[PDB]
Every structure is written in structure tokens, then in C-alpha cells.
Structure 1
Amino acid sequence: HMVVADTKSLKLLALADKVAKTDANVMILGPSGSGKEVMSRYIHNASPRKEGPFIAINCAAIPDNMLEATLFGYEKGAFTGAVQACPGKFEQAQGGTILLDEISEMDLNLQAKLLRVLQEREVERLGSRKSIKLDVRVLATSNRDLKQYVQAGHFREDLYYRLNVFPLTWPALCERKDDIEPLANHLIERHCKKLGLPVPSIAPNAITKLLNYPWPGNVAELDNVVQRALILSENGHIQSEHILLEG
């Protein structure tokens, strides 16, 4: 789960705890990453719905234009290709929490649909006129200023406010450098756990080399550098020579 050390991150987890015990929609802003989903589950496991299902969907990763079809579901013959009936992600997240990752990639028409789901607390599959009563807690993320996206006319203003009741800005890695070392060691361990290998120590100069890199790719880039260093050290003591950043 969430492993931090920087004071700004600790403050952000503190806020995450306050909103967790409620049913408010959480908007996780900041650069795109995987932490956002690490917090989403954290919020879930801290919410009164910890035993409920946790469903995640990335609105910027679904090919063949099946974002709409995945969210709301569809009946047999709702569109060219719909060979079967299929429950939406909202249905699978009944009594639990759904995560709409990268929500800023929804077209204006899809937002108008999503708005109705939030308002009516009911969902209807594509090609269906039957509504489904919904008890689902909604989380969402965005790597861009939604307020300006509303101004640009690419996002609904009404939907914007309904989702920004409790925004949390999960910052880049360079703005929380105290998180780098705990995160680095965490990646080393979980990768050693995959292969039954003992976790190796990490050199001081290696750490200093990591702390002083701006990390434009954030956690995703850190995971690469670490995994790369583990290859170089052959799962052994990693030193500054094993740390190859874009420098």
C-alpha cells in the first residue's frame, strides 16, 4: 500500500483518512501514475466499505473504443460486435468502490451519461431501457487541471463540481523527495519477493544519486531504474554504477 515519509505526503494521507470514512467522491489530481490507485485502495480499505468490491477502470487505456461499453455494460446487439450481454463496471462495484482513472478522457457525451449515474444513483446498460439501482462509491483521477478543462469546454462544469468535492493533489516525485528512498527499497523488495531472492542492501552514493534526480517519469521511471540496477547488480548490493538515469 501507501509507503511515504515526506511531510506533505503524510498530510495528504491524513486527509485521505478523513474522506475515507465518508461517501464523498474523491478526485486524485497530479501527474499520472499508479500511486493514485494505491491511494484509491487505501481509501477503500479505510472506508466503511472495506469488505465491498474494489473495481478499477482506466479511461485512457481501453482499446477499440469500448470505454462506454465497459462502464455501463451492454445487451446483446447494443452495437456492432456486441455478441453477448455484459454487466458494466458499475454493476461489478455494487456495495463497494469504483475507480474512474484518468476521467478527463471521457467525451462530453460520456460525461453526460456519467452525470446521470451520479445524480440518479442508477445505471442502464447500452441497448437497455431498464435501470439498475446502484450503491457505489465513486473515485476518479486526472493528470490535468479539470477546472481549465471545463473552461476549454472539454468537460462539463456540473460534473466537475460533483467530482471535486474533495480533491487530493498527489504531487510529482521531485516535490516529495523524502518518499524516494522508502519507495525505492519497496520496489527492490517486492521484486525480490517475486523470485524468492533475498533483498539486497542499497549503497549511500546510490541513494544520493537517486535523490538528486528530478524524476520526470515519477514512480514509473523509478521502478525502471531500480529494476535495471537489480539486473546490473544481479540482485546483489546495488551501487552508484548500477544506477543509470537519463544523465
Structure 2
Amino acid sequence: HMVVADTKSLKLLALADKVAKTDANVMILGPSGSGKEVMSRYIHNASPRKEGPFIAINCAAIPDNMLEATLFGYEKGAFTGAVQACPGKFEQAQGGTILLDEISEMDLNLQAKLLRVLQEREVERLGSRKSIKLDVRVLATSNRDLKQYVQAGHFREDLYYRLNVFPLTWPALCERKDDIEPLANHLIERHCKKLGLPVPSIAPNAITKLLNYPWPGNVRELDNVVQRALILSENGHIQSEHILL
């Protein structure tokens, strides 16, 4: 469930609803913790593939450099430690959507293979010469500017244009201030639902405190402040702290 109240955010929402009906690649941009991931999940559920699989892979969080292995999958003995066969992420997303979180940090080599997959609608596992027809909708996410990455030599131009037909950008939280109260309430309800507890309320004062803070860490940071506030138990007074904790 995605909270949208600010008029810039409704604009975003209506853009997203448009692409979500289609099978175009969606590039979801925005600063840290600004909600790129809930947007990607929103588009899947808004899309005609809603009932199909939703597979995510964070290319910025895959240790041991198993990014290529995770993506394409592999056969037993495709490399050191390949002790078994293993389907790629694309295989799991058949008939649904795949989310490439942070394609920016994918290496050039891997970008090449990914491009071919996008061009061919096919994929082979590492160690395999057998092709697999894909019916997969593609979403991607980036924290960097891909254009600048292309200009800087770290990203392929052709891969760029393919992934960026329809880019969606979250404004930073301080640019869409009307989202703050609705978001704050949501995060409170969220957390309290988890713990069987009834949701408390937030003092006007506390709300004001939340409104006049620029939120460098955006909605992630807000969520942090909200959870903190609940520990200083259930309400919302000046139980909000940002930078004097």
C-alpha cells in the first residue's frame, strides 16, 4: 500500500498507472529511502501481471560477487562453488515482473549480457548453452544518475536507452511535504500492527516538528524517527528527535 497525498506525488502516481498497464521497462529514480522499492511493487500490482511472480534482486547487495550467477542461474560446475544447478532470477519471474534494484552498480560485462537478454527475450545459465524464452516485465532502480554514468564510461549507452524509456522519479521528502503526515501515520500504524498494539496519535506539536525537518534520509529516516518515538512509549509528543538524540 503506497501512501500518496502531495500533489507532486499524485502526478507521479498517475504517470506510474500509465506505464503499469503496459509492458515497457520502468526505471525508478529518487534519493535514498524515497520509496523506489514500494513504487516498483506498486507498478506490479497495478499491472496486468499483478497475479504473476514478483522477483527482486539488489545488484548492490549481492555478496561474494554472485550477481551474474544469481541473475542468469547456473549448472552444477559452472564455477568454483557451483555445487548444484540453480535457476536465475529471470526464470523465477516468468509471467510476472523482475526488479533490478540498483542496476547502476552492475559491471560493464554483466551489462552486456543483460542487454542481450533484453534484446532477445531469452537467457542461458552460466555453463549452459541452452536458451530459455522469457515473458518477463522489467523494472529497475537506481540511486545514481545513469546518464552521467554513461558519460563517465561506467554504463552502456544502448542499455541506458532501453531501460529509460519511461523513468519515474521520487521527489525528496522535503520537496513533497504534504506526504509527511500521511506517511508518519502509516508508519505508526504499520509498526503497531506488527505488535498487536493499537495505534496511538501524534500531537500537533510533534507533527510540526516532523514538517520542518528536511529529511536527508527521506521516508526511511522518518520511519526510524517514528519507531524511535514509539519506544519513548505510545504517543507522539516532542518524542521526535533528529540530530541531538
* Same fold by TM-score greater than 0.5: yes
Once residues 171 and 124 of structure 1 are traced to their aligned partners in structure 2, the CA distance between those partners, rounded to angstroms, is: 38
**Compared CA separation, residues 92 and 75, structure 1 to 2 (3 A):** same
Q: Is the 8 A contact 1:94 1:136 kept in 2?
A: yes
Once residues 236 and 164 of structure 1 are traced to their aligned partners in structure 2, the CA distance between those partners, rounded to angstroms, is: 42
Once residues 38 and 25 of structure 1 are traced to their aligned partners in structure 2, the CA distance between those partners, rounded to angstroms, is: 16
**Compared CA separation, residues 197 and 131, structure 1 to 2 (3 A):** same
Once residues 196 and 244 of structure 1 are traced to their aligned partners in structure 2, the CA distance between those partners, rounded to angstroms, is: 31
Once residues 160 and 242 of structure 2 are traced to their aligned partners in structure 1, the CA distance between those partners, rounded to angstroms, is: 45
Return the offset for 1:39: 1.0
**Compared CA separation, residues 87 and 241, structure 1 to 2 (3 A):** closer
Q: Is the 8 A contact 1:54 1:97 kept in 2?
A: yes
**Compared CA separation, residues 191 and 243, structure 1 to 2 (3 A):** farther
Q: Is the 8 A contact 1:229 1:244 kept in 2?
A: no
Once residues 236 and 209 of structure 1 are traced to their aligned partners in structure 2, the CA distance between those partners, rounded to angstroms, is: 11
SS in 1 for 2:141: strand
Residue deviations 1:181-220 (CA, integer Å, cap 9, x gap): 1111111111101111010010111011011111111111
**Compared CA separation, residues 174 and 130, structure 1 to 2 (3 A):** same
Residue deviations 1:85-106 (CA, integer Å, cap 9, x gap): 0000100000000000111000
Q: Is the 8 A contact 2:29 2:143 kept in 1?
A: yes
Return the offset for 1:241: 7.2
Return the offset for 1:242: 10
Return the offset for 1:234: 4.4
Q: Which residue of 1 aligns with 2:211?
A: 211
Q: Which residue of 1 aligns with 2:108?
A: 108
Return the offset for 1:136: 0.2
Once residues 85 and 155 of structure 1 are traced to their aligned partners in structure 2, the CA distance between those partners, rounded to angstroms, is: 30
Residue deviations 1:49-82 (CA, integer Å, cap 9, x gap): 1111011111101111111111100110111001
Q: Does 1:169 align with 2:169?
A: yes
Greater than 3 Å deviation, 4+ residue runs: 234-245
SS in 2 for 1:229: helix
Once residues 34 and 44 of structure 1 are traced to their aligned partners in structure 2, the CA distance between those partners, rounded to angstroms, is: 18
Q: Is the 8 A contact 1:203 1:240 kept in 2?
A: no
**Compared CA separation, residues 43 and 80, structure 1 to 2 (3 A):** same
Return the offset for 1:45: 1.1
Q: Does 1:227 align with 2:227?
A: yes
Return the offset for 1:235: 5.9
Q: Is the 8 A contact 1:225 1:244 kept in 2?
A: no
Once residues 241 and 50 of structure 1 are traced to their aligned partners in structure 2, the CA distance between those partners, rounded to angstroms, is: 39
The worse-fitting range, judged by mean Cα deviation, of 226-235 and 89-98 is 226-235
Once residues 89 and 225 of structure 1 are traced to their aligned partners in structure 2, the CA distance between those partners, rounded to angstroms, is: 34
Return the offset for 1:144: 1.3
Once residues 82 and 4 of structure 1 are traced to their aligned partners in structure 2, the CA distance between those partners, rounded to angstroms, is: 44
Once residues 244 and 93 of structure 1 are traced to their aligned partners in structure 2, the CA distance between those partners, rounded to angstroms, is: 45
SS in 2 for 1:64: helix
Work out the number of aligned pairs and report it: 245
The worse-fitting range, judged by mean Cα deviation, of 10-19 and 39-48 is 39-48
Q: So what's the TM-score if we normalise by structure 1?
A: 0.95
**Compared CA separation, residues 26 and 102, structure 1 to 2 (3 A):** same
Q: Percent identity?
A: 100
Return the offset for 1:32: 3.1
Once residues 23 and 66 of structure 1 are traced to their aligned partners in structure 2, the CA distance between those partners, rounded to angstroms, is: 28
5+ residue gaps in structure 1? none
Q: Is the 8 A contact 2:33 2:217 kept in 1?
A: no
Return the offset for 1:33: 2.9
Residue deviations 1:21-42 (CA, integer Å, cap 9, x gap): 0000000111133621211111
Q: Is the 8 A contact 2:34 2:218 kept in 1?
A: no
